[PDB]
Each structure stands twice: as C-alpha cells, then as structure tokens.
C-alpha cells in the first residue's frame, strides 16, 4: 500500500490512501515496525534523487532497493515537486504518531538505521532520508527520569 501511494493516476492514489488509513487505524501496532520505516525512507530518497534527473532524458522508471517494485514519475518539474512535497507530510505524521506512544523502540530502530556503510559514502551529498531521520527525532522527544514529575 505504501509503494502504491504514488501512482500516476488520480483516483488510484486516493483509494490507496484510504485503504492505508483504514489499515493503520485498525492495526495500530504496525507503526513501530522495523521494516516500514526503512522502506518509506528508501522510497523518499528515491523520489528526492529523481527530483532532478534530466526530464528530457528517457527511462523515468526507478527500482526500489531491497524490494522488487518500480516507480514512474511525471514529465514536468512542477508535478514532481508537488508529489514529493505531498508525500513529505505522511512521513512526519506517522513518525510523530509512532514516537508519541513507544519512543524507546522507534528510537532504537532509528539508531540502528543510521549505521549502514552504503549510506555513509553518500552522506556528504543530500541523502534526504538521513536528514529526515536526524530531524524528526528532536521535536517529538520527551523528558528523562530526573525531570519526569515536576510542577511548573
């Protein structure tokens, strides 16, 4: 359902979004899973890389690493920017939803994700996935043991 969220048509993505919302509503425990986050970061990085890839050049297809699928992109720059900006909000929404309930497990998963050799070489470039991961950790953090029970 996540990989079908960015279809080229109009109603397909809407119905996919509705199905995803229903599925995540009836099964809350999928938020803190250890595979959904990696897949969504990978597809976000793929879209960010495809943002500027010489639109006139052919072959708009792309391959998602570690998962057999493909993604098609529109022709104009404006449509691509619009779709990537639209997708860049669900990531934050579900990240804050997951961090609200069980911060420990999702924090540990995020720490584990940032320890791969392949991404370290390209970290000197944009690598939007790592930036998202290191930016979403702070403003959903909480108090520690010492400052958990006090009155302002």
């Amino acid at each position: 359902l996540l990989v079908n969220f960015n279809h080229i048509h109009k109603r397909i993505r809407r119905v996919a979004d509705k199905y995803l919302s229903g599925l995540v509503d009836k099964f809350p425990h999928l938020l803190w899973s250890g595979t959904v986050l990696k897949t969504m970061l990978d597809i976000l990085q793929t879209l960010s890389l495809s943002l500027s890839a010489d639109i006139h050049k052919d072959q708009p297809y792309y391959d998602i690493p570690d998962a057999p699928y493909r993604i098609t992109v529109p022709d104009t720059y404006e449509a691509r920017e619009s779709i990537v900006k639209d997708f860049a909000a669900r990531c934050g929404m579900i990240l804050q939803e997951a961090m609200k309930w069980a911060p420990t497990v999702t924090k540990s998963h995020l720490q584990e994700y940032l320890n791969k050799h392949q991404n370290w070489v390209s970290g000197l470039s944009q690598h939007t996935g790592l930036a998202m991961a290191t930016e979403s950790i702070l403003h959903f953090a909480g108090y520690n043991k010492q400052n958990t029970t006090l009155g302002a």
Partner: protein, 144 residues
C-alpha cells in the same frame, strides 16, 4: 556517390501523374568513398528509391539543400537538438534530374484525403491517449 548498386527490382516500376516520369527501386550496398574509388578500377545492404524527372529545372533545390546542410552542421556543432532531413538530388541533363526518395514516404495530402480530419485524431488512433510515453516522445520529436 558513396554506394555501389547491387541489383534492380524488375517489378517496382510505377510512373506517376504529370513529361513522362517514373519511379525506380534498387538494392544497393554502402561502402564509402575512397574504397569505392579504388574498387571501381578493378571490376549493411539496403534498398533505395529514385525518381527521374524530365523537362524541369533542378538548380534552386541544390541551393536550398546546401543551406539546409550548413544549418544542420551549425546546429550539430553548437550542441542543440534540431532535426532536418537533407535528401539528395542531382541534375544530369538539361531538364533532367534524379531525386532521392525518403524511406517510408507518407504524404500529408493522402492522409488528409483518407481521414478528412485533423492530425490529432490520427496521432491518437496511431499511438493512443496523450498520457502514454509514446505520445510524449512523438510530441517531442514533432516540436524538434
């Protein structure tokens, strides 16, 4: 002058309306220029179509095609993307000339007579909806 004729098709003769011109088909091989020059003193295969015209001048077209070739060379050197097809033609006798034919000739007038509609409908029927990739590539080539 950069090809060696191999044979002639004995069933492709078709005179056109007009002055008695006709159309001819040959099976030819492409070798080059210097190699052809050296091989002509001792004795990648395609087909070509030639049109023989009698009683008409063929000199302005040479200027037009020379200018077209020069423009194509300039555009190719600069690094842009412009498409032009400089078909060749040579006049040999007063009022007599030989004209090359572009492969897969398709006159606009014949298509208009067959369809009696705009070319947009023809393209939509040929390739499909505007949302496909083939339509986009055809549009890009047409703009070029």
């Amino acid at each position: 002058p950069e090809a060696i004729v191999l044979d002639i098709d004995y069933k492709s003769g078709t005179p056109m309306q007009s002055k008695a011109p006709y159309l001819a088909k040959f099976k030819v091989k492409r070798c080059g220029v210097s190699e052809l020059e050296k091989e002509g003193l001792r004795c990648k295969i395609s087909w070509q179509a030639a049109i023989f015209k009698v009683g008409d001048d063929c000199r302005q077209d040479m200027l037009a095609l020379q200018i077209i070739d020069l423009f194509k060379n300039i555009f190719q050197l600069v690094g842009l993307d412009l498409f032009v097809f400089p078909y060749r033609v040579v006049a040999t006798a007063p009022g007599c000339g030989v004209i090359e034919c572009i492969p897969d000739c398709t006159s606009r007038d014949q298509l208009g007579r067959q369809t009696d509609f705009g070319m947009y409908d023809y393209f939509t029927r040929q390739y499909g909806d505007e949302s496909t990739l083939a339509f986009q590539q055809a549009r890009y080539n047409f703009i070029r």
